Design a protein around this ligand. Structure first.
Ligand SMILES: Cc1cc(C(=O)N[C@@H](CC(=O)N2CCC[C@@H]2c2ccccc2)C(=O)N[C@@H](C)C(=O)NCc2ccc(F)cc2F)no1
Ligand SMILES: Cc1cc(C(=O)N[C@@H](CC(=O)N2CCC[C@@H]2c2ccccc2)C(=O)N[C@@H](C)C(=O)NCc2ccc(F)cc2F)no1
Ligand SMILES: Cc1cc(C(=O)N[C@@H](CC(=O)N2CCC[C@@H]2c2ccccc2)C(=O)N[C@@H](C)C(=O)NCc2ccc(F)cc2F)no1
Ligand SMILES: Cc1cc(C(=O)N[C@@H](CC(=O)N2CCC[C@@H]2c2ccccc2)C(=O)N[C@@H](C)C(=O)NCc2ccc(F)cc2F)no1
Ligand SMILES: Cc1cc(C(=O)N[C@@H](CC(=O)N2CCC[C@@H]2c2ccccc2)C(=O)N[C@@H](C)C(=O)NCc2ccc(F)cc2F)no1
Ligand SMILES: Cc1cc(C(=O)N[C@@H](CC(=O)N2CCC[C@@H]2c2ccccc2)C(=O)N[C@@H](C)C(=O)NCc2ccc(F)cc2F)no1
Ligand SMILES: Cc1cc(C(=O)N[C@@H](CC(=O)N2CCC[C@@H]2c2ccccc2)C(=O)N[C@@H](C)C(=O)NCc2ccc(F)cc2F)no1
Lengths: 222, 222, 223, 222, 223, 223, 223
């Protein structure tokens, strides 16, 4: 797997590949790893599939639960803390092979500067969290290739569309070097998934635009 | 890795993919896994790369050594036996992680019926060898996918071209279901390799013909 | 074992072999591995016989339990989640050898398009689930053979007859390459079991129809 | 450690960092890890220092040895083979923690096309060897970062000088993300070492040029 | 990691590096390891990032919890005891790999001599605690280089400014000899953090001040 | 560590070194290992620092807790038994490396002959206690050097001053032959600590007196 | 153990402590760990005493053997290589607990200018070797403290005499922080041993000069 998240002026973007493996064997081609966990938050998990899906579902439920009980959504800090506590809860099973690392991306409606209200948070198997203050981050077996690619491409990010394009390119490179990360499949028409978040909330990026960006990248490297 | 071999009327064809992994990481994209070990025999190996290459080189040198010392090539049974012995000798190292299994294709100039003078021989880690009588065979992490593909496609083989087609398509299904087997790279222009052997000997199938076949398959499945 | 399931226009079909082994020894020849778990869903399980039987029985009981307590049947998603939870619960035992993997085929009466209301769902030992969007799937020791077979035959599936044919042939290829999957036994008259599900519910396939299909496949492979 | 090597029109360049560690403790600041192993080849090793130095010294002795015994140097293929044999010979010790991997950069005086006479060969612990066709390569605890950096920077290589700059930058990104690879030390004035090889032979790149390049990179990233 | 702390006439200073690692890979560049845990104390922690952050957070919360429950803050000895107990509770996890050792700096308002009211306390994995009576201490993978450095520099501490400088130079030596401690980053403008505590309380040292001291130290080492 | 305790006419003296180590590394130069546990008893502990300090503190709290609850202090036998029970209760952790052995010195106000009212009780890891009838005892890694020294020097004890001297010399020999026991540090003016108990209770011995005794021993061995 | 060596303008100096241990027990007070292995080189070994002494003896014999056989002494690089090969050869015993690590200090009579002909080479258990270009190095249980001490004191090295002072003070700091390295023993009159090498060869430093320096260092730390 590879999940990528990067900040652009006024919002944030997260993308994920579609591949699922059992050792060397390909067990899935269209798995959706990026979830809209609330109006201003998207979560993307890598690792054991059962644990990842459970993480996304339970997490979303917990946030909305607090929102309905208290009539107000948690602060972003509280969201980070809840996610980390959940990851720490699974540490023993993670030692037994059921490991799942999430990557958090959101838009903080209470931050001071609305242009820099975008947020990207990494986690580790111990439940330690770190807010990324350098614009992008990745997680999964291709996360280093995606981070080194974004390190070079990030200067092209000036708005939503350029940020989305750099995210899809970083997923392209991750898949280029990591056999556990699926690239674009032109035969079947399956492309990475994406969520973008700004002042109006978190929305699913349409498949078509991601496909145009992918084909452009492909034709550019030929 | 996936290596395939199949018999067509009056000849045999062997083809292999180009991928090399270190776990999940792609360590090579243009590897050659099918070596012409002599004028009438080709060998394709799956497993530890350092071991497979040594297998091919040493095997070729042994067959030619016998030829030059005794003025005549080994009978096909002799070639089989020497390869089996070489594999058996590597069993200890193979248990300690350095495993490599070969597949042998050949054209027996001493067969009665030149129509079925093709030969396909498969091997196991303990030196066991079996002459395949059902037409085709495969070795490597994708070999089950490729064999089950050739089970459905083999009835279409009536000559070298259809055999090459079924071979490339079998490698395609392999890459499709196994991340350790590489599919055709249309961006970089890299395709599987193929050796074809008939009465005029063993010869390397040129890249452009395999590329044509691969593009046909890709266009058909869209 | 091999269980296969596949979608066809307006329905789903699932079939399973009849073999039971203790290592190399054959301990059963007529096992029923595919169960009608409710009016619109079948479950086929591969693994330790005892755990597979218990799974099917407890699962059917659970769905009907909810239905009677609440007056309405669970959504298909609910059914998935429930089977996955039950598999997750058995993980510790699975680590010690009491392993069972199910496969779920069903018709969703609440789907928008009635012709694509078929559903195929696969699971792993950790309770992960995936809704299969390529129309066919399989589980058990023969599942790779059966899947690579259906990968070539699936273009022939245009109705329930064709889908049943493809499914029986996939079980045949599985039995052909995997010794823990039993092929048709013409001497004893024992053939794989199968269920078909569509808008009118889920029905067992009479043994004689599977017999006809098995004889067709055999004679085809013969000449 | 990180060792990089890339091809440019008419030659090859190799560069390595200067860091030696004992776990977390920095035990070395000016280690030379890239050696001119003969008039047309340089080797750079990562891993256990004792083994690395042993490899460089002994390998050089073996090449020159053959040359004096036989009046002519080994073919590049022979050099590759000898280095792979050495590495395989160290495999048991490597299994016991005495691991060391070489990277080979050469210029083949017997190549047909003088522009594409550059050679880069990577190795694994089993003695497997692979000639790199895609232009660059690296080895060591930072090789992944350096390779992903060169993936984006390689299109700037048009002569020896731009290739050297790209190499030094790749080492810079390695040091950036990998604590076992040392960056430029402006306080002590210690910089990566580099060897450059073309038709006129292999020569050490003078430290001053690497200092200039490193400072250009540093200023650029400020 | 390297956390240092030292006493000067009238107060105490504590400073920490910014690096985060996962084996050899650098995973963090701006990590805050030194926290103001109450108006007159600062805890810095080395070890597993998760455990460290939870230690600082829970410790601060506990101190304020006592303060608000009983109307008065804990005695410094009480604070030491609470932190020691927290460290001891984590011992099993620590042996399992989730190790975290704190270092505690403080200014005791209830001490006899305000000029010597500064306090430095070090801890071990079993929860043992020692009040340092030689003026400086350090925790982490570069703590020994830091302490040996402060042994030679400490006679230059006569006030808060000299103390801050010596602390930053000790972290400099630590990063100089420890790949796991991060030295000043002049390209990104990231420097160690520091807290200073006197009778007016505990304040964060502004980044610009640490940057000035770092630049001065680096110029010194260059010439 | 080395703690020593010896009886003199009408009282008892206990003294301990000041060193703390982690393997070979010195982690403490001024550690106090001899605690006044009540007006008529001092305890000195060897082993893991955190356990030693916890023992001393908890034991004092227990003795005073009883004294306040029942209006009267425990008899000396009672104090022995509580210390022994505390030690036994730690035997599992001691098995896993949290090992700490105390050494008790006291003055039994209820004894008939005030000349022999001094008491010295040694313990082992399983809770065993033994009242020492021969007048001196020691505990720790230097304990054998200290006991063999006092075997030769004890006949010179006729009052508190000679007893104190012999205790300091015992510790001096211990430090001389045991690296985990700290000799006197004349560069820093740190010397072993001593508690003395007679009918007027237990008091800390001023550092000055121990210092003069130490210097007298050092010169007496310089020539 | 702690061995130090540093370059001074015109030569090199090596100094070694005198302690021997068996666990915490001090087994030796007068060990000589720094050997004149030939006219221009000294070797100081840390580790198992039998292995270290064997190393010094056999290495000296080997050098002189070559010298008498070929009429000319080995190049300094050759000396390095022979020592490294010896260490590498003992690696297996070293892993069974018979570990010994040498430090080599020499004067290369073939260097261009004689003011920088000093050489300091360190080694590891695998036979790796490194010519130190920063002026100083130490090996042993106290080498970290000694190195971080010389890091600060090395600017004071301007000739052989100041070199010896800094070497002895590095050893003093090592003994201050490491119980396995022995400090100066003023009662018994035992001090570290030292060799100095210049163009006139290698010479043992007379005990009286080492004692002078030691007393100066002590009377400086104390006041
Ligand atoms: C224990 C244990 C582990 C596994 C295992 O490896 N299970 C695989 C998954 C798998 O084979 N099956 C088959 C049936 C359903 C389940 C699936 C669920 C969802 C999607 C695709 C498949 C896995 O977890 N593989 C890992 C390596 C993986 O590919 N993870 C990708 C992933 C990331 C995030 C996410 F939300 C979902 C994902 F699948 N099985 O038992
Ligand atoms: C022990 C040990 C094993 C390995 C290891 O995993 N070594 C990898 C190979 C690898 O990373 N490198 C990098 C430098 C050279 C070597 C390479 C050689 C030839 C071609 C491409 C690369 C492997 O053996 N991977 C296996 C799983 C593989 O991919 N094998 C494919 C293969 C089959 C036949 C053949 F002839 C060549 C092949 F690469 N390393 O140490
Ligand atoms: C522990 C342990 C496991 C076993 C074991 O391997 N027990 C065998 C089964 C077996 O020998 N006997 C004999 C009498 C009853 C029992 C049976 C039950 C039901 C049906 C046919 C037989 C098994 O579990 N074999 C596995 C490998 C198998 O063949 N499983 C096929 C299967 C799948 C699903 C299902 F519902 C029923 C099945 F038999 N014994 O102890
Ligand atoms: C067994 C065993 C292993 C080690 C060990 O970790 N030994 C370290 C090296 C080390 O501490 N010392 C100190 C004295 C000489 C030796 C050194 C050699 C050469 C240069 C600088 C120092 C190592 O090998 N570390 C590895 C991880 C390393 O840093 N490798 C970088 C490197 C690559 C190629 C090369 F030629 C030289 C190198 F140092 N020691 O015993
Ligand atoms: C089990 C297990 C261990 C680890 C692990 O090694 N986790 C690393 C930390 C890490 O890679 N990540 C990535 C995202 C979150 C987490 C992070 C949190 C906060 C700040 C920066 C990062 C660690 O713990 N490394 C240790 C060795 C370390 O670097 N410790 C320095 C440190 C000290 C105090 C402190 F408060 C925070 C620190 F990072 N993960 O699972
Ligand atoms: C598990 C585990 C063990 C240790 C460990 O060995 N911890 C050391 C002590 C140590 O390094 N530190 C560092 C700061 C706090 C703590 C300290 C506490 C109190 C006084 C001085 C230091 C120890 O216990 N060493 C033992 C071998 C020792 O020297 N014990 C002497 C001693 C006896 C009685 C007593 F009351 C205090 C003592 F220090 N740590 O985690
Ligand atoms: C196995 C095994 C190990 C040991 C062991 O611990 N052997 C001790 C040495 C020891 O107790 N004795 C007593 C009589 C002779 C022998 C001695 C030799 C020479 C000088 C002084 C004593 C050691 O090796 N201790 C180590 C930890 C040590 O202290 N090493 C310091 C040292 C370095 C270099 C050198 F040349 C001599 C030294 F003593 N014995 O068997």
């Amino acid at each position: 797997t590879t999940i990528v998240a990067l900040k652009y002026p006024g919002g944030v973007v997260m993308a994920g590949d579609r591949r699922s493996t059992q050792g060397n064997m390909i067990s899935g081609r269209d798995v959706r790893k990026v979830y809209i966990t609330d109006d201003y938050t998207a979560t993307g998990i890598a690792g054991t599939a059962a644990v990842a899906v459970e993480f996304a579902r339970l997490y979303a439920v917990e946030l909305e639960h607090y929102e309905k009980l208290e009539g107000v959504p948690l602060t972003f800090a509280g969201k980070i803390n809840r996610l980390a506590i959940m990851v720490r809860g699974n540490l023993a099973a993670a030692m037994q092979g059921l490991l799942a690392l999430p990557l958090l991306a959101g838009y903080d409606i209470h931050a001071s500067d609305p242009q820099s209200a975008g947020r990207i948070v990494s986690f580790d198997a111990a439940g330690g969290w770190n807010i990324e203050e350098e614009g992008y981050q990745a997680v999964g077996s291709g996360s280093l290739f995606a981070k080194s690619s974004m390190k070079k491409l990030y200067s092209q990010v000036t708005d939503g569309d350029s940020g989305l394009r750099v995210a899809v390119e970083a997923l392209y490179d991750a898949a280029d070097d990591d056999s556990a990360t699926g690239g674009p499949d032109l035969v079947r028409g399956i492309f990475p998934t994406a969520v973008i978040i700004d002042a109006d909330g978190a929305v699913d990026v349409p498949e078509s635009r991601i496909a145009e960006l992918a084909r452009a990248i492909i034709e550019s490297r030929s």
